[PDB]
Amino acid sequence: SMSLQVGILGNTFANPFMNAAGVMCSTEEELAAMTESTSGSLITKSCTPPRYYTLPLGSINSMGPNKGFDFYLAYSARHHDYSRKPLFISISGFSAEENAEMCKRLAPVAAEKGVILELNLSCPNVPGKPQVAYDFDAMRRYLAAISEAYPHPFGVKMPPYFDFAHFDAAAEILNQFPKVQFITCINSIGNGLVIDVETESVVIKPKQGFGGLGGRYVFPTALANVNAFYRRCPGKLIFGCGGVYTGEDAFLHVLAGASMVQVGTALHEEGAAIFERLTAELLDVMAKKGYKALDEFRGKVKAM
Amino acid sequence: SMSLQVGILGNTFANPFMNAAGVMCSTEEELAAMTESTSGSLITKSCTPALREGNPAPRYYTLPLGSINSMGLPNKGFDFYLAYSARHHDYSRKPLFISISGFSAEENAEMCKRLAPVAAEKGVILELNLSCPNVPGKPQVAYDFDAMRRYLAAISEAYPHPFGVKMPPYFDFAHFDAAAEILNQFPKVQFITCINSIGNGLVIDVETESVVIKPKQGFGGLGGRYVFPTALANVNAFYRRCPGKLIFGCGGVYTGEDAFLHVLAGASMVQVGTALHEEGAAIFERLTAELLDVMAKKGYKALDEFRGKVKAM
Numbered sequence: 001s002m003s004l005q006v007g008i009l010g011n012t013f014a015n016p017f018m019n020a021a022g023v024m025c026s027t028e029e030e031l032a033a034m035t036e037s038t039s040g041s042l043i044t045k046s047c048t049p050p051r052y053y054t055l056p057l058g059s060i061n062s063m064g065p066n067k068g069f070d071f072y073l074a075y076s077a078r079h080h081d082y083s084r085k086p087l088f089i090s091i092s093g094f095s096a097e098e099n100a101e102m103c104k105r106l107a108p109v110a111a112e113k114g115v116i117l118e119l120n121l122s123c124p125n126v127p128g129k130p131q132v133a134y135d136f137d138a139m140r141r142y143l144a145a146i147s148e149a150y151p152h153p154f155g156v157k158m159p160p161y162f163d164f165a166h167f168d169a170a171a172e173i174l175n176q177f178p179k180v181q182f183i184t185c186i187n188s189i190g191n192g193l194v195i196d197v198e199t200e201s202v203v204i205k206p207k208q209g210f211g212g213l214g215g216r217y218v219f220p221t222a223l224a225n226v227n228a229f230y231r232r233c234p235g236k237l238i239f240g241c242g243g244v245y246t247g248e249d250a251f252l253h254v255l256a257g258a259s260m261v262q263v264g265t266a267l268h269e270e271g272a273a274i275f276e277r278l279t280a281e282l283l284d285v286m287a288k289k290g291y292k293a294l295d296e297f298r299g300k301v302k303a304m
Numbered sequence: 305s306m307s308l309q310v311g312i313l314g315n316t317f318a319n320p321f322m323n324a325a326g327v328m329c330s331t332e333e334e335l336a337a338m339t340e341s342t343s344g345s346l347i348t349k350s351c352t353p354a355l356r357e358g359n360p361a362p363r364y365y366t367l368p369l370g371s372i373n374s375m376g377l378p379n380k381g382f383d384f385y386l387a388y389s390a391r392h393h394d395y396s397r398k399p400l401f402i403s404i405s406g407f408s409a410e411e412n413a414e415m416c417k418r419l420a421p422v423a424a425e426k427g428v429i430l431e432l433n434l435s436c437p438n439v440p441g442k443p444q445v446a447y448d449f450d451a452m453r454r455y456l457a458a459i460s461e462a463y464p465h466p467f468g469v470k471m472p473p474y475f476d477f478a479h480f481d482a483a484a485e486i487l488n489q490f491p492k493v494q495f496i497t498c499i500n501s502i503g504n505g506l507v508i509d510v511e512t513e514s515v516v517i518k519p520k521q522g523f524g525g526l527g528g529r530y531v532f533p534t535a536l537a538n539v540n541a542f543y544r545r546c547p548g549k550l551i552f553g554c555g556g557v558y559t560g561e562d563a564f565l566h567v568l569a570g571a572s573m574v575q576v577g578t579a580l581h582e583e584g585a586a587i588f589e590r591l592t593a594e595l596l597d598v599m600a601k602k603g604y605k606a607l608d609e610f611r612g613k614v615k616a617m
């Protein structure tokens with residue numbers, strides 16, 4: 001009598017789980033593996049018109065690499081089985097102009113197939129360019145340019161914030177753009193640094209070893225960002241991303257406000273079989289509490 | 305022939321370790337325990353001009369991989385820590401730092417005016433907190449570069465001695481460059497402590513479905529293993545950008561290997577917060593032994609043989 005279904009963006013998703021953009025989604029074989037999996041959805045690698053490393057408590061990466069917009073647009077147009085599950089496409093152009101150009105072309109494919117855009121405003125490894133959403137004027141201009149060029153709804157992938165003045169400013173900007181229908185919190189925590197004791201060397205080569213953190217390191221930061229935007233953007237959906245390894249982690253993301261739950265580091269380590277385990281663990285927690293649907297507790301974190 | 309000594313700021317420190325501000329340093333009993341410990345130094349709780357009781361409890365919580373807190377600046381008040389520095393601290397045991405965290409530039413400058421004669425006579429060293437993440441309505445001062453500059457200007461006018469600054473974590477090179485450009489314009493800033501807690505994380509208990517600390521809807525500063533790669537990145541970013549200042553490392557230190565990495569990234573002193581909260585002051589015996597082990601396996605005889613020498617790829 002229980003269900004993980006999520007009914008959003010006019011679709012019924014079988015469950016809230018999907019891969020995080022950039023994990024298991026660059027090669028046609030990875031897309032296929034994601035489509036074959038029990039995940040509720042999947043998203044493509046952020047496309048444009050040692051770089052990874054496993055840590056004890058997560059991951060660090062300086063990917064900075066994609067088969068181009070045309071490969072993922074082509075996959076969205078005539079290669080993805082939409083009868084299996086809905087599909088998201090991530091774009092991370094190097095300017096508002098590039099982003100707008102890519103959106104003009106995705107518009108027909110989005111109308112004819114139903115693929116959904118997530119705009120990446122938070123790459124932390126872009127040489128010479130800080131996270132777009134750490135610059136609220138650039139953020140506003142990207143969103144305006146995309147809203148004028150792109151007729152369909154879209155979502156935004158946000159970087160983590162760390163104080164209420166930034167939450168308030170970010171939400172006030174997003175609330176002016178009705179085409180932004182969902183907000184994904186969070187991208188990796190930017191520009192961490194990992195050093196190996198034995199070699200006394202950084203573990204990734206680009207950018208003097210600085211890279212984005214994922215995994216167990218980022219979970220309380222991810223929950224905070226999910227909840228902060230859930231409270232400030234009641235007219236939008238929040239997707240949670242960050243630190244999910246168990247159905248109990250996913251349960252907390254939903255409690256904080258998440259509609260969908262994306263899985264990055266833990267999926268990179270465990271492969272697509274993880275979604276079989278995650279759905280069963282989440283249903284297990286719900287059973288123990290007597291919940292029958294996610295709508296019963298999404299966003300219902302209590303003050304103590 | 306191996307040595308953990310640090311010679312900085314006109315002082316000799318027996319080793320690089322001290323508490324992080326706010327941990328085991330609020331009462332006379334805690335400060336005495338830190339002085340009797342084997343730490344190379346110690347720092348007082350960040351203080352305000354008047355006594356404060358802090359945020360309502362629970363305001364601290366132990367996490368799987370660290371801590372979250374919204375302490376809210378509970379502290380005995382500046383007069384108490386000034387008196388400890390002036391009259392109670394045994395400087396023949398080790399040097400002392402005092403952390404101040406007034407709610408405005410003027411509050412800080414007034415405290416510095418009274419601290420100045422005690423610093424001159426006794427040698428206590430000031431650390432200015434520009435990174436509380438739990439001040440109601442006032443964001444981390446160092447997240448607002450105009451306010452940061454204003455604070456440093458006000459302190460530098462009011463205070464004749466060199467001092468240090470406790471910094472929040474930054475997460476992109478544009479902010480590192482902007483913060484370092486400001487710090488490099490104030491010659492009295494002699495050390496930079498990276499980092500304060502990662503601000504405004506959130507923890508929820510599965511069983512009760514509720515936040516685990518009371519203030520601010522459950523939001524609070526993260527310490528511990530969560531913050532270690534961020535802390536090293538901040539230590540190294542400012543080590544590279546502020547060669548004329550010392551960097552003190554703070555964040556995620558539970559072992560001598562963690563401390564070794566802080567020093568490799570550029571740290572002169574290494575501060576210990578969450579781990580010391582959990583283990584108590586005997587931790588410093590373990591950390592010095594562990595760091596000496598790392599050094600012995602590598603043939604290092606002094607910290608200057610590898611401080612700041614992290615290798616690129």
Ligand SMILES: Cc1cc2nc3c(=O)[nH]c(=O)nc-3n(C[C@H](O)[C@H](O)[C@H](O)COP(=O)(O)O)c2cc1C
Binds near residue numbers: 046063218263266
């Ligand atoms: C190797 C790797 C590549 C990634 N590539 C992208 C990307 O292209 N676009 C994006 O928005 N996020 C990207 N991410 C970030 C993830 O989508 C996610 O936000 C982050 O890893 C936090 O989730 P996690 O804790 O489950 O790893 C990447 C992460 C990793 C580890």
Ligand SMILES: Cc1cc2nc3c(=O)[nH]c(=O)nc-3n(C[C@H](O)[C@H](O)[C@H](O)COP(=O)(O)O)c2cc1C
Binds near residue numbers: 375531554555
């Ligand atoms: C309970 C608690 C109280 C703290 N109080 C202060 C403080 O008064 N002033 C300050 O600069 N930092 C304070 N901090 C931050 C620590 O000094 C330190 O920067 C942070 O905990 C990261 O270090 P760690 O990973 O070793 O815990 C406090 C941290 C905790 C957990």
Ligand SMILES: *[C@@H](c1ccccc1)C1C(=O)NC(=O)NC1=O
Binds near residue numbers: 063123
């Ligand atoms: C940013 C990215 C990289 C290549 C193409 C498009 C976007 C990406 C990264 O490298 N590391 C991250 O942690 N998150 C990202 O989104």
Ligand SMILES: *[C@@H](c1ccccc1)C1C(=O)NC(=O)NC1=O
Binds near residue numbers: 326351500
């Ligand atoms: C901030 C603080 C502010 C005024 C007086 C004393 C302490 C403090 C906090 O509450 N939590 C932290 O993580 N770091 C701090 O410095």
